Amino acid sequence: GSLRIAVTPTFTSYFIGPLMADFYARYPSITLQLQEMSQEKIEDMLCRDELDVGIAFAPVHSPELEAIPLLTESLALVVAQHHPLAVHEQVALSRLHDEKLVLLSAEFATREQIDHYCEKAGLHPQVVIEANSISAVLELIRRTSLSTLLPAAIATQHDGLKAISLAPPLLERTAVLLRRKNSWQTAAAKAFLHMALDKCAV
Amino acid sequence: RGSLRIAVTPTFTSYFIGPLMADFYARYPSITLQLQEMSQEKIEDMLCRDELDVGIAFAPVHSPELEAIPLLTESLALVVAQHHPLAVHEQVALSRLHDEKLVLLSAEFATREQIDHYCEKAGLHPQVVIEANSISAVLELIRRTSLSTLLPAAIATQHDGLKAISLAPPLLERTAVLLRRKNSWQTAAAKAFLHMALDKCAV
């Protein structure tokens, strides 16, 4: 194998795709392996040299891993263009109380965070639908007048979808690139790192 | 105004379940829905333990306590972007796979397993340059490259930039099925769901 990549669920919906596409077009000779998994798994596998690169969020728990700040992803209210709030670019955080949501199941870290900071903010929106797949959530949102909580970037990837900013912010996480320290990377791994970083410089 | 737990195999998530769940929700907004995609072995098991109300997978069903209602016929196609050299065709010879550089689902997936099986059976050994454990990742990769993939043609009708090329002869054809535990009485939500799923397939 030439390059094993693992990322937490959300990056699969807007980040890793465009990146691996570019990487492949540049170094077609390198075969790629991509797996979306929980940060615990990514960290574990990187320590066991079962993965070359990882993408997750701070803080990193394993001391043997190095973390390179990638980007700051903040959750937003993702809706269809026909959702009554779509007319806005930003709405009060208090708007969530009346939102009927479609959320990822507890399995996902994002959901976990949503629950934590919602209760923290005194917000208890009604979860009418739950799914264990981001795409399913997006699919349901496109066809309904419901909403979801996901990083804003995912919305820029779909026309019928729009990300509404929350004021004040519910959750903001720092995306990071993970690799095992004191471990020499292949030329592929290094070019990967570089490219990932060049993409977040815009 | 209660609940309804649904589970489907990976491929249905990318074209079937979404539109159906949205319709069901608009029709019966009081019912809270639970959707989970997983291996058929898990769906079957969970249905047996009354942990799921409805399942969607393929024939043959292994568990004898489960009932199986034929839903539709899903056949694998070569899915590519519109800028893919073969996109101009609607159907191509199965032999064209030898020259295709693919992006496929990993072994974890049943579809992948099937592909590897019938490919070998057909004497086809295409080169897999990229593997992922998510259909969306595969599709995302195909849209931005000139690579192809093997997935049920329907998936393509959900994306503009994508197109499904029919294979002649066909590589794989599976029978989609609705799963529920027999001798088990369904809720009104479960029943209405079953109905809607069938109305959508002209079944």
mmCIF file of N, CA and C in Angstrom, chain A residues 12-14 16-22 24-25 28 30-37 100 105 107 126-133 135-136 139-140 142-144 146 157-158, chain B residues 13-15 17-22 25-26 29-38 101 106 108 127-134 136-137 140-141 143-145 147 158-159:
data_model
loop_
_atom_site.group_PDB
_atom_site.id
_atom_site.type_symbol
_atom_site.label_atom_id
_atom_site.label_comp_id
_atom_site.label_asym_id
_atom_site.label_seq_id
_atom_site.Cartn_x
_atom_site.Cartn_y
_atom_site.Cartn_z
ATOM 1 N N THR A 12 -15.484 13.827 5.681
ATOM 2 C CA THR A 12 -15.882 13.018 4.544
ATOM 3 C C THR A 12 -16.874 13.761 3.647
ATOM 4 N N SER A 13 -17.653 14.653 4.246
ATOM 5 C CA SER A 13 -18.660 15.398 3.522
ATOM 6 C C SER A 13 -18.252 16.731 2.904
ATOM 7 N N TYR A 14 -16.971 17.088 2.916
ATOM 8 C CA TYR A 14 -16.582 18.360 2.304
ATOM 9 C C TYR A 14 -15.088 18.571 2.174
ATOM 10 N N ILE A 16 -12.017 15.861 2.755
ATOM 11 C CA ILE A 16 -11.216 14.788 2.181
ATOM 12 C C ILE A 16 -11.456 14.502 0.693
ATOM 13 N N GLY A 17 -12.697 14.665 0.240
ATOM 14 C CA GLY A 17 -13.027 14.390 -1.148
ATOM 15 C C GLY A 17 -12.226 15.206 -2.142
ATOM 16 N N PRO A 18 -12.372 16.533 -2.112
ATOM 17 C CA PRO A 18 -11.644 17.418 -3.024
ATOM 18 C C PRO A 18 -10.126 17.259 -2.906
ATOM 19 N N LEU A 19 -9.660 16.952 -1.704
ATOM 20 C CA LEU A 19 -8.241 16.793 -1.449
ATOM 21 C C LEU A 19 -7.674 15.525 -2.095
ATOM 22 N N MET A 20 -8.273 14.376 -1.809
ATOM 23 C CA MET A 20 -7.794 13.124 -2.391
ATOM 24 C C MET A 20 -7.906 13.157 -3.922
ATOM 25 N N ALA A 21 -8.913 13.860 -4.431
ATOM 26 C CA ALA A 21 -9.108 13.978 -5.869
ATOM 27 C C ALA A 21 -7.903 14.670 -6.486
ATOM 28 N N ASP A 22 -7.488 15.765 -5.857
ATOM 29 C CA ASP A 22 -6.340 16.530 -6.310
ATOM 30 C C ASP A 22 -5.055 15.741 -6.144
ATOM 31 N N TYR A 24 -4.663 12.492 -6.073
ATOM 32 C CA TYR A 24 -4.621 11.418 -7.052
ATOM 33 C C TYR A 24 -4.212 11.935 -8.424
ATOM 34 N N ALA A 25 -4.829 13.031 -8.849
ATOM 35 C CA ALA A 25 -4.533 13.614 -10.148
ATOM 36 C C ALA A 25 -3.072 14.026 -10.237
ATOM 37 N N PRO A 28 -0.924 9.933 -9.481
ATOM 38 C CA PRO A 28 -1.759 8.778 -9.852
ATOM 39 C C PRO A 28 -1.166 7.413 -9.490
ATOM 40 N N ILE A 30 0.202 6.567 -6.739
ATOM 41 C CA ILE A 30 -0.022 6.212 -5.347
ATOM 42 C C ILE A 30 -1.457 5.740 -5.126
ATOM 43 N N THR A 31 -1.604 4.506 -4.654
ATOM 44 C CA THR A 31 -2.932 3.962 -4.387
ATOM 45 C C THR A 31 -3.367 4.454 -3.011
ATOM 46 N N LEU A 32 -4.617 4.893 -2.928
ATOM 47 C CA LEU A 32 -5.160 5.441 -1.695
ATOM 48 C C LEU A 32 -6.213 4.615 -0.965
ATOM 49 N N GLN A 33 -6.123 4.661 0.361
ATOM 50 C CA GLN A 33 -7.049 3.964 1.241
ATOM 51 C C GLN A 33 -7.652 5.043 2.151
ATOM 52 N N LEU A 34 -8.974 5.175 2.120
ATOM 53 C CA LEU A 34 -9.662 6.159 2.946
ATOM 54 C C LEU A 34 -10.726 5.509 3.814
ATOM 55 N N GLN A 35 -10.673 5.772 5.116
ATOM 56 C CA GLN A 35 -11.657 5.218 6.046
ATOM 57 C C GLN A 35 -12.136 6.286 7.010
ATOM 58 N N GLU A 36 -13.448 6.385 7.177
ATOM 59 C CA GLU A 36 -14.007 7.357 8.101
ATOM 60 C C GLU A 36 -14.286 6.620 9.396
ATOM 61 N N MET A 37 -13.765 7.136 10.505
ATOM 62 C CA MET A 37 -13.951 6.480 11.793
ATOM 63 C C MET A 37 -13.865 7.452 12.956
ATOM 64 N N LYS A 100 -37.201 21.778 14.428
ATOM 65 C CA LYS A 100 -37.390 20.340 14.512
ATOM 66 C C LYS A 100 -36.168 19.869 13.729
ATOM 67 N N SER A 105 -26.784 10.197 15.094
ATOM 68 C CA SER A 105 -27.042 9.486 16.340
ATOM 69 C C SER A 105 -25.856 9.623 17.299
ATOM 70 N N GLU A 107 -23.758 7.884 18.393
ATOM 71 C CA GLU A 107 -22.534 7.251 17.942
ATOM 72 C C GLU A 107 -21.489 8.312 17.577
ATOM 73 N N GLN A 126 -36.209 19.838 19.601
ATOM 74 C CA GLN A 126 -36.817 18.537 19.360
ATOM 75 C C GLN A 126 -36.146 17.774 18.203
ATOM 76 N N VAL A 127 -35.674 16.563 18.475
ATOM 77 C CA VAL A 127 -35.026 15.743 17.452
ATOM 78 C C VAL A 127 -36.075 14.796 16.895
ATOM 79 N N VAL A 128 -36.652 15.148 15.757
ATOM 80 C CA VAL A 128 -37.704 14.335 15.182
ATOM 81 C C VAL A 128 -37.226 13.153 14.363
ATOM 82 N N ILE A 129 -35.998 13.250 13.849
ATOM 83 C CA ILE A 129 -35.384 12.193 13.050
ATOM 84 C C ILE A 129 -33.918 12.092 13.389
ATOM 85 N N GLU A 130 -33.440 10.853 13.472
ATOM 86 C CA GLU A 130 -32.059 10.531 13.803
ATOM 87 C C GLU A 130 -31.507 9.556 12.753
ATOM 88 N N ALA A 131 -30.271 9.775 12.311
ATOM 89 C CA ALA A 131 -29.669 8.904 11.307
ATOM 90 C C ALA A 131 -28.203 8.701 11.622
ATOM 91 N N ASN A 132 -27.636 7.588 11.168
ATOM 92 C CA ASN A 132 -26.226 7.316 11.434
ATOM 93 C C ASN A 132 -25.391 7.537 10.181
ATOM 94 N N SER A 133 -25.804 8.513 9.376
ATOM 95 C CA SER A 133 -25.125 8.859 8.128
ATOM 96 C C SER A 133 -25.373 10.323 7.759
ATOM 97 N N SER A 135 -24.965 11.901 4.919
ATOM 98 C CA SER A 135 -25.648 11.999 3.645
ATOM 99 C C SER A 135 -27.143 11.852 3.823
ATOM 100 N N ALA A 136 -27.546 10.907 4.660
ATOM 101 C CA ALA A 136 -28.967 10.670 4.917
ATOM 102 C C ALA A 136 -29.581 11.938 5.520
ATOM 103 N N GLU A 139 -29.929 14.428 2.852
ATOM 104 C CA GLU A 139 -30.993 14.013 1.941
ATOM 105 C C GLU A 139 -32.354 14.390 2.511
ATOM 106 N N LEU A 140 -32.574 14.035 3.772
ATOM 107 C CA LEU A 140 -33.817 14.354 4.448
ATOM 108 C C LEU A 140 -34.051 15.860 4.530
ATOM 109 N N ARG A 142 -32.962 18.216 2.453
ATOM 110 C CA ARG A 142 -33.238 18.767 1.130
ATOM 111 C C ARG A 142 -34.709 18.621 0.793
ATOM 112 N N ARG A 143 -35.276 17.482 1.181
ATOM 113 C CA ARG A 143 -36.664 17.173 0.880
ATOM 114 C C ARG A 143 -37.685 17.619 1.906
ATOM 115 N N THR A 144 -37.231 18.157 3.029
ATOM 116 C CA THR A 144 -38.163 18.603 4.065
ATOM 117 C C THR A 144 -37.912 20.046 4.451
ATOM 118 N N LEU A 146 -37.105 20.707 7.566
ATOM 119 C CA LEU A 146 -36.481 20.470 8.845
ATOM 120 C C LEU A 146 -35.086 21.047 8.760
ATOM 121 N N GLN A 157 -21.075 22.598 -0.329
ATOM 122 C CA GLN A 157 -20.906 21.476 -1.244
ATOM 123 C C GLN A 157 -22.204 21.090 -1.935
ATOM 124 N N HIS A 158 -23.308 21.664 -1.478
ATOM 125 C CA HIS A 158 -24.612 21.358 -2.051
ATOM 126 C C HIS A 158 -25.427 22.625 -2.318
ATOM 127 N N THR B 13 -29.098 3.773 1.262
ATOM 128 C CA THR B 13 -28.966 5.078 1.860
ATOM 129 C C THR B 13 -28.697 6.137 0.803
ATOM 130 N N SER B 14 -28.003 5.748 -0.264
ATOM 131 C CA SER B 14 -27.640 6.679 -1.326
ATOM 132 C C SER B 14 -28.669 6.952 -2.425
ATOM 133 N N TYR B 15 -29.897 6.467 -2.281
ATOM 134 C CA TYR B 15 -30.878 6.733 -3.316
ATOM 135 C C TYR B 15 -32.299 6.373 -2.970
ATOM 136 N N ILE B 17 -33.884 5.142 0.576
ATOM 137 C CA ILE B 17 -34.376 5.556 1.881
ATOM 138 C C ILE B 17 -34.615 7.054 2.124
ATOM 139 N N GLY B 18 -33.736 7.891 1.584
ATOM 140 C CA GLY B 18 -33.868 9.324 1.758
ATOM 141 C C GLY B 18 -35.218 9.853 1.306
ATOM 142 N N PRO B 19 -35.545 9.735 0.011
ATOM 143 C CA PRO B 19 -36.822 10.203 -0.539
ATOM 144 C C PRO B 19 -38.035 9.577 0.163
ATOM 145 N N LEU B 20 -37.918 8.305 0.513
ATOM 146 C CA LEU B 20 -39.004 7.602 1.179
ATOM 147 C C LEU B 20 -39.258 8.079 2.608
ATOM 148 N N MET B 21 -38.194 8.339 3.352
ATOM 149 C CA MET B 21 -38.304 8.811 4.728
ATOM 150 C C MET B 21 -38.892 10.236 4.755
ATOM 151 N N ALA B 22 -38.456 11.064 3.810
ATOM 152 C CA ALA B 22 -38.927 12.436 3.708
ATOM 153 C C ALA B 22 -40.439 12.457 3.420
ATOM 154 N N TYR B 25 -42.241 11.267 6.533
ATOM 155 C CA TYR B 25 -42.258 12.333 7.525
ATOM 156 C C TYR B 25 -43.256 13.433 7.189
ATOM 157 N N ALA B 26 -43.303 13.862 5.935
ATOM 158 C CA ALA B 26 -44.245 14.919 5.568
ATOM 159 C C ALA B 26 -45.684 14.445 5.748
ATOM 160 N N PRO B 29 -45.833 13.608 10.261
ATOM 161 C CA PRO B 29 -44.895 14.368 11.099
ATOM 162 C C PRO B 29 -44.856 14.034 12.583
ATOM 163 N N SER B 30 -45.892 13.384 13.101
ATOM 164 C CA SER B 30 -45.916 13.038 14.528
ATOM 165 C C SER B 30 -45.046 11.832 14.871
ATOM 166 N N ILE B 31 -44.691 11.031 13.870
ATOM 167 C CA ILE B 31 -43.858 9.867 14.119
ATOM 168 C C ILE B 31 -42.364 10.189 14.045
ATOM 169 N N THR B 32 -41.657 9.910 15.127
ATOM 170 C CA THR B 32 -40.232 10.149 15.161
ATOM 171 C C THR B 32 -39.533 8.949 14.513
ATOM 172 N N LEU B 33 -38.584 9.258 13.630
ATOM 173 C CA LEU B 33 -37.861 8.240 12.876
ATOM 174 C C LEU B 33 -36.413 8.036 13.284
ATOM 175 N N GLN B 34 -36.004 6.772 13.192
ATOM 176 C CA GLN B 34 -34.659 6.308 13.509
ATOM 177 C C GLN B 34 -34.153 5.531 12.291
ATOM 178 N N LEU B 35 -33.111 6.051 11.640
ATOM 179 C CA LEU B 35 -32.515 5.417 10.460
ATOM 180 C C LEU B 35 -31.059 4.992 10.699
ATOM 181 N N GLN B 36 -30.743 3.743 10.387
ATOM 182 C CA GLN B 36 -29.381 3.257 10.564
ATOM 183 C C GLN B 36 -28.990 2.373 9.400
ATOM 184 N N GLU B 37 -27.814 2.613 8.843
ATOM 185 C CA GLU B 37 -27.370 1.786 7.752
ATOM 186 C C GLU B 37 -26.360 0.823 8.351
ATOM 187 N N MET B 38 -26.456 -0.446 7.963
ATOM 188 C CA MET B 38 -25.561 -1.471 8.482
ATOM 189 C C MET B 38 -25.592 -2.735 7.626
ATOM 190 N N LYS B 101 -9.748 2.229 -14.194
ATOM 191 C CA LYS B 101 -9.100 2.418 -12.907
ATOM 192 C C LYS B 101 -10.246 2.822 -11.984
ATOM 193 N N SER B 106 -14.592 -0.648 0.309
ATOM 194 C CA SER B 106 -13.690 -1.630 0.895
ATOM 195 C C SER B 106 -14.446 -2.932 1.170
ATOM 196 N N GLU B 108 -15.251 -4.430 3.652
ATOM 197 C CA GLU B 108 -16.259 -4.324 4.692
ATOM 198 C C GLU B 108 -17.649 -4.421 4.074
ATOM 199 N N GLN B 127 -8.200 -2.740 -12.016
ATOM 200 C CA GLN B 127 -7.276 -2.197 -11.031
ATOM 201 C C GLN B 127 -7.994 -1.214 -10.105
ATOM 202 N N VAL B 128 -7.867 -1.437 -8.802
ATOM 203 C CA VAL B 128 -8.489 -0.562 -7.816
ATOM 204 C C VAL B 128 -7.403 0.398 -7.305
ATOM 205 N N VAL B 129 -7.441 1.633 -7.798
ATOM 206 C CA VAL B 129 -6.460 2.635 -7.412
ATOM 207 C C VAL B 129 -6.840 3.359 -6.117
ATOM 208 N N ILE B 130 -8.130 3.385 -5.799
ATOM 209 C CA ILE B 130 -8.602 4.035 -4.579
ATOM 210 C C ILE B 130 -9.775 3.293 -3.935
ATOM 211 N N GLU B 131 -9.678 3.077 -2.624
ATOM 212 C CA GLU B 131 -10.723 2.410 -1.837
ATOM 213 C C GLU B 131 -11.192 3.332 -0.704
ATOM 214 N N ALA B 132 -12.477 3.277 -0.393
ATOM 215 C CA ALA B 132 -13.026 4.082 0.697
ATOM 216 C C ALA B 132 -14.136 3.287 1.392
ATOM 217 N N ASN B 133 -14.448 3.642 2.636
ATOM 218 C CA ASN B 133 -15.488 2.930 3.370
ATOM 219 C C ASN B 133 -16.788 3.724 3.455
ATOM 220 N N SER B 134 -17.009 4.565 2.448
ATOM 221 C CA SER B 134 -18.192 5.407 2.359
ATOM 222 C C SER B 134 -18.577 5.634 0.894
ATOM 223 N N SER B 136 -20.486 7.994 -0.372
ATOM 224 C CA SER B 136 -20.394 9.413 -0.701
ATOM 225 C C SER B 136 -18.972 9.804 -1.088
ATOM 226 N N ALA B 137 -17.999 9.228 -0.389
ATOM 227 C CA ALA B 137 -16.588 9.489 -0.676
ATOM 228 C C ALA B 137 -16.273 8.973 -2.085
ATOM 229 N N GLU B 140 -17.886 11.325 -4.488
ATOM 230 C CA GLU B 140 -17.173 12.591 -4.463
ATOM 231 C C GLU B 140 -15.902 12.470 -5.309
ATOM 232 N N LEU B 141 -15.179 11.368 -5.120
ATOM 233 C CA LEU B 141 -13.942 11.116 -5.852
ATOM 234 C C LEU B 141 -14.159 10.974 -7.351
ATOM 235 N N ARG B 143 -16.628 12.307 -9.154
ATOM 236 C CA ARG B 143 -17.027 13.582 -9.731
ATOM 237 C C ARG B 143 -15.822 14.440 -10.098
ATOM 238 N N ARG B 144 -14.765 14.346 -9.300
ATOM 239 C CA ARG B 144 -13.584 15.165 -9.523
ATOM 240 C C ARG B 144 -12.443 14.484 -10.255
ATOM 241 N N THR B 145 -12.666 13.272 -10.737
ATOM 242 C CA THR B 145 -11.614 12.548 -11.443
ATOM 243 C C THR B 145 -12.194 11.897 -12.685
ATOM 244 N N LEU B 147 -11.941 8.647 -13.008
ATOM 245 C CA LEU B 147 -11.986 7.275 -12.537
ATOM 246 C C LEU B 147 -13.449 6.832 -12.531
ATOM 247 N N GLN B 158 -29.417 10.246 -8.877
ATOM 248 C CA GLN B 158 -29.524 11.174 -7.758
ATOM 249 C C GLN B 158 -28.511 12.316 -7.879
ATOM 250 N N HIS B 159 -27.535 12.148 -8.765
ATOM 251 C CA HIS B 159 -26.501 13.157 -8.962
ATOM 252 C C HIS B 159 -26.413 13.581 -10.417
#
